[PDB]
Amino acid sequence: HGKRLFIIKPSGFYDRRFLKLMRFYILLTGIPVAIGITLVNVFIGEAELADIPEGYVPEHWEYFKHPISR
């Protein structure tokens, strides 16, 4: 049946465009951040706790565990 009718509605162009732009910019910066965090976690981080060797005074950033925090 060719009874197809026109549906009157407001424009969805501008809402869709805003959503696409926001997603694009958020992903643009957040995908490299997630990739970098994953690589740092897999290949570098998670220092292990140790006793301070006698006569050695550690630096202030050596009292933290995560490499990004350090």
Partner 1 sequence: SGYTPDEKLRLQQLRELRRRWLKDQELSPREPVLPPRRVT
Ligand X SMILES: CCCCCCCCCCCCCCCCCC(=O)OC[C@H](COP(=O)([O-])OCC(O)COP(=O)([O-])OC[C@@H](COC(=O)CCCCCCCCCCCCCCCCC)OC(=O)CCCCCCCCCCCCCCCCC)OC(=O)CCCCCCCCCCCCCCCCC
Q: Which residues bind to ligand X, rule: CB under 6 A? A: 26-27, 30-31, 33-34, 37-38, 41-42, 45-46, 66
Q: How far, CA to CA in Å, does 60 sit from each of 5, 27, 40, 43, 53?
A: 72, 34, 21, 23, 16
Rounded to the nearest 5°, which phi and psi values hold at 36? -65, -40
Q: Which does 4 bind (CB under 5 to 8 A by kind): partner 1, ligand X, none?
A: partner 1
- The set of residues, in sequence order, having a beta carbon less than 8 Å from that of 61 and lying 6+ positions away, is 70
Binding mask 1-30 for partner 1 (x = CB under 8 A): -xxxxx------------------------
Binding site partner of 5, from partner 1, ligand X, none, Cβ cut-off 5-8 A by kind: partner 1
